[PDB]
């Protein structure tokens, strides 16, 4: 009976920007997927490569839970083959992904009167991410001939910009919550099973 | 917050020199461009130069190459713009603004008069 | 004067106007376009950089687009208090430095 540690996941009080997004590798445990797929808390719930009801019934070798926060239009760039500068500069998912997509409204707990201003994203990047990367630099964005040598000017501009969470804003605008469940089979002793397993 | 505190309002008569300060607060002085901009009264923004307060290094408009000299002094975090040999014409507000401009000083006016 | 913009526009409240400016190709064809906004009696504000983006704190009212050696600057739901003068700028690649448009004032009908 080791039971997995969702619960430390999903109801962490504080969750990263979506730029450095946080990963979290889930082993040797026996994990309620059923809790999770039928809780009326997640607004989104969408699977790839899985059925959701199959979950309690199989075992992996290993489960890895990434979870950040967005806006809730760019809810939609977290999904195989997107685009936006969610899925080309902060989080990108395989074409061939394996796992789930959780999110929920979190205006109560990210919004701020007057602008939440913590949580970041990338939105210059000479290059796409390649899947599961994760770009945690700050270098200054050199658009044009001339280097930067750490200076920020014309066409050198910092690579981060900060969401603005207010809780007026629509719900395209307020923050979610979210975590993606990623399901790896290797060439191992399978160590995450599902209670009916 | 981002502040940039210029000195206050000159007057100062044609062929005399004029030096006006801006003080940065709010952010690493050395991290970001510094120019300036000049608007006569009542007409368009008239870019005049920058300098890297970091290298020191300067950058002049060419209708000001020869009258103009920027400078830096990062122990204060301010900035300083010098026009000599002042003209009639040179009336104006001008302005400090760091970066693409993403930051503005309140504006100095300086009154050329004999 | 470097770059081009129309002297004046102006539209009714609540309505939508643009804002054009013109370059060539050795500023607007090769660098980014940046837009400010003058309030009557005070100083510049930074309104949009790198061509599209918001600076924190800055409605999504405004909007901006280049196309080509060309700029424009939309703005959406006007209010009165977006009566001000704006200025496009960019850096030139011939002059080695940023150069601006020659303004452009705002009305909004009332």
């Known amino acids: 009976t080791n039971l997995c540690p969702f619960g430390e996941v999903f109801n962490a009080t504080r969750f990263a920007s979506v730029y450095a997004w946080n990963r979290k590798r889930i082993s040797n445990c026996v994990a309620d997927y059923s809790v999770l797929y039928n809780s009326a808390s997640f607004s989104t719930f969408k699977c790839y490569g899985v059925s959701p009801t199959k979950l309690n019934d199989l075992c992996f070798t290993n489960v890895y839970a990434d979870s950040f926060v967005i806006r809730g239009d760019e809810v939609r760039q977290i999904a195989p083959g997107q685009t936006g500068k969610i899925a080309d500069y902060n989080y990108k998912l395989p074409d061939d992904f394996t796992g789930c997509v959780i999110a929920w409204n979190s205006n109560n707990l990210d919004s701020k009167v007057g602008g939440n201003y913590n949580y970041l994203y990338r939105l210059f990047r000479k290059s796409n991410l390649k899947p599961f990367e994760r770009d945690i630099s700050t270098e200054i964005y050199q658009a044009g001939s001339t280097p930067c040598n750490g200076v920020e000017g014309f066409n050198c501009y910092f690579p981060l910009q900060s969401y603005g969470f207010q809780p007026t804003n629509g719900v395209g605008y307020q923050p979610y919550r979210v975590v993606v469940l990623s399901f790896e089979l290797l060439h191992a002793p399978a160590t995450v099973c599902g209670p009916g397993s | 917050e981002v502040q940039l505190v210029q000195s206050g309002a000159e007057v100062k008569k044609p062929g005399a020199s004029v030096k006006v300060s801006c003080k940065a607060s709010?952010?690493?002085?050395?991290?970001?461009?510094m120019h300036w901009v000049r608007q006569a009264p009542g007409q368009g923004l008239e870019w005049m130069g920058r300098?890297?307060?970091?290298?020191?290094?300067?950058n002049y408009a060419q209708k000001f190459q020869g009258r103009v000299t920027m400078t830096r002094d990062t122990s204060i975090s301010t900035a300083y713009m010098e026009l000599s040999r002042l003209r009639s014409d040179d009336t104006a507000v001008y302005y400090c603004?760091?970066?693409?401009?993403?930051?503005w000083g309140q504006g100095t006016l300086v009154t050329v008069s004999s | 004067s470097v770059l081009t913009q129309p002297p004046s526009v102006s539209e009714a409240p609540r309505q939508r106007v643009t804002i054009s400016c013109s370059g060539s190709?050795?500023?607007?064809?090769?660098?980014?376009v940046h837009w400010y906004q003058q309030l009557p009696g005070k100083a510049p504000k930074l309104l949009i950089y790198?061509?599209?983006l918001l600076p924190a704190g800055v409605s999504d009212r405004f909007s901006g687009s280049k196309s080509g050696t060309s700029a424009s600057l939309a703005i959406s739901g006007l209010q009165s208090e977006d009566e001000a003068d704006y200025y496009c700028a960019a850096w030139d690649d011939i002059l080695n430095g940023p150069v601006f448009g020659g303004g452009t004032k705002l009305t909004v009908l009332g």
């Open positions: 190709s050795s500023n607007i064809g090769h660098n980014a």
């Open positions: 790198y061509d599209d």
């Open positions: 300098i890297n307060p970091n290298s020191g290094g300067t």
């Open positions: 603004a760091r970066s693409y401009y993403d930051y």
């Open positions: 709010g952010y690493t002085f050395t991290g970001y461009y």
